[PDB]
């Protein structure tokens, strides 16, 4: 098993930057995909960004390309994700997810582990 803790959320000014982090506990010494998701008020959980295990392959949703950046330090077993140029459409609860393999899916049914999530209001 693996536990994920999201950290770094809050409110920010319309147009401001922010960087969420997700800390993994349990078994970090094994293949596990890392992706960020979000869910807006009355909106189904959608994909935001993902990163493979090695830390070379990544992908972003169209709504956030250019702005957001994803990264991971598996030594400290975490995964940061810069969120520059925020917008009130960016307001949602952001979840950190893991699915054990060697890649990063674009769906929410590909993951196996989920954090509790942090609120982000803009």
């Amino acid at each position: 098993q693996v536990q994920l803790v999201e950290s770094g959320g809050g409110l920010v000014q319309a147009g401001g930057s922010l960087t969420l982090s997700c800390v993994a506990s349990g078994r970090p010494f094994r293949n596990y995909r890392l992706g960020w998701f979000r869910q807006a008020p009355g909106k189904e959980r959608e994909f935001v960004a993902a990163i493979n295990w090695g830390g070379v392959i990544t992908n972003y949703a169209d709504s956030v390309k250019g702005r957001f950046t994803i990264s991971r330090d598996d030594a400290k077993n975490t995964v940061y994700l810069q969120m520059n140029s925020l917008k009130p459409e960016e307001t949602a609860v952001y979840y950190c997810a893991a699915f054990d393999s060697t890649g990063s899916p674009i769906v929410r049914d590909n993951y196996e582990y989920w954090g509790q999530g942090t609120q982000v209001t803009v």
Binding site: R30, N31, N52, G54, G55, V56, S101, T102, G103, S104
Partner: protein, 419 residues
């Protein structure tokens, strides 16, 4: 390098030969740079997609090694074992406490950065059982170009027939060329090495049969070391005693080369036996290519001491066959004459009491033990020429050998002493 002159006109000559580096890479010199070995793999497609990918790809001549790696991952990802004791190797603590360790805890997972392929349905999870066993077995099958020894595919076919009665090889006869390329993908070798290394620790796992096909990865390109074990077993002498019976300078340099002190060659479960497929080393230090005189010397001495494995051991090129053979003759003759029979168990607390009142001076007789210091002296009393009893002994050992292959030390010894 010493000055050489031509005596007819005092002209100085510089005898020089072409040089070949061919350096040697030890495993522990890899881990002081990187504290982990990566496995490049693609985790995009799903398991049941890869099953038809490699099944329909196997049935035809086309298959992507990326797909059999990516399929072998998820096909072997949920296999585990509970460690009785800790497991660490070259500064890598793979297992901590009582926590279970999987088959890919040994390596680190990275992402490969695609083959279009072709899919198939109706392929259930009953093929996830043996398709890894198959793909692993073809690594061992596809390393030998002999027509009948490559018929280990019948034993992979059999070992999978044990898993499912109606298993028949999903590969065309031309397939004898299909899995020969798999051994060139670094990640596939990093898979088979992790499978064998895992199943060596967890020995009685229900999936231990998977080790078939990966067992050829253990101590691959490490023959000379196995000849040192075979000699230390056939002679019955300790490693330190056998080490003294090295009388050739080349075998001395090679024996110093193999026994560098920080390569975990004595650990039971270590990364060392898989230094080639893991990529810890590109030129093994324990091969019979970098230790030729040791392979020839130890194998020949074993053969003279009634060995069976040595009858087919291959004779290396460009070594001192004469000096090496004489050394093996004195060694094998010493071990042969000195059986060193000694009483082990007694009944009425009566042991053999040797008689010291034998003073007729039975000199000019070979030594009584297996000490090198005495056999070199006796050999000096023989003018450093093998006595007719030594040559006759070797003839007795090599005669009645039949079915000998060419370029083997069995046919060499037979052709040398049997006349």
């Amino acid at each position: 390098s010493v000055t050489v002159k031509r005596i007819i006109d005092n002209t100085v000559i510089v005898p020089k030969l072409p040089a070949n580096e061919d350096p040697v890479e030890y495993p522990a010199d890899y881990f002081r740079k990187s504290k982990e070995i990566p496995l490049y793999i693609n985790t995009t497609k799903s398991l049941s997609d890869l099953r038809g990918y490699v099944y329909q790809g196997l049935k035809s001549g086309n298959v992507s090694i990326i797909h059999v790696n990516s399929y072998l991952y998820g096909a072997l990802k949920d296999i585990r074992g509970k460690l009785d004791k800790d497991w660490s190797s070259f500064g890598i603590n793979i297992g901590k406490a009582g926590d279970t360790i999987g088959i890919f805890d040994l390596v680190s997972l990275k992402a490969l950065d695609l083959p279009d392929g072709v899919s198939d349905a109706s392929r259930t999870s009953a093929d996830d059982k043996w398709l890894p066993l198959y793909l692993l077995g073809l690594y061992r099958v596809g390393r030998t170009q002999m027509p009948e020894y490559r018929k280990k595919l019948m034993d992979g076919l059999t070992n999978q027939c044990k898993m499912i009665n109606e298993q028949f090889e999903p590969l065309v006869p031309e397939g004898r060329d299909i899995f020969d390329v798999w051994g060139n993908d670094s990640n596939y070798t990093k898979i088979v090495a992790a499978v064998d290394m895992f199943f060596h620790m967890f020995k009685k796992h229900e999936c231990a049969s998977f080790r078939y096909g990966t067992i050829v990865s253990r101590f691959k390109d490490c023959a000379a070391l196995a000849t040192f074990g075979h000699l230390c077993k056939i002679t019955g002498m300790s490693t330190e005693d056998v080490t003294t019976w090295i009388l050739n300078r080349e075998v001395a340099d090679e024996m110093v080369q193999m026994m560098l002190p920080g390569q975990e060659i004595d650990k039971a479960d270590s990364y060392m036996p898989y230094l080639i497929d893991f990529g810890l080393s590109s030129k093994s230090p324990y091969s019979s290519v970098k230790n030729p005189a040791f392979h020839f010397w130890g194998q020949l001495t074993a053969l003279l001491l009634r060995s069976t494995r040595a009858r087919n051991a291959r004779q290396p090129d460009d070594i001192e066959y004469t000096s090496l053979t004489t050394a093996g003759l004195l060694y094998a003759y010493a071990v042969g004459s000195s059986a060193d029979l000694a009483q082990q168990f007694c009944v009425g607390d009566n042991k053999y009491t040797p008689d010291d009142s034998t003073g007729g001076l039975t000199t000019n007789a070979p030594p009584q033990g297996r000490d090198v210091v005495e056999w070199l002296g006796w050999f000096e009393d023989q003018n450093r020429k093998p006595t007719p009893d030594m040559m006759q002994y070797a003839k007795r050992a090599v005669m009645s050998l039949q079915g000998l292959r060419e370029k083997t030390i069995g046919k060499y010894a037979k052709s040398e002493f049997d006349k």
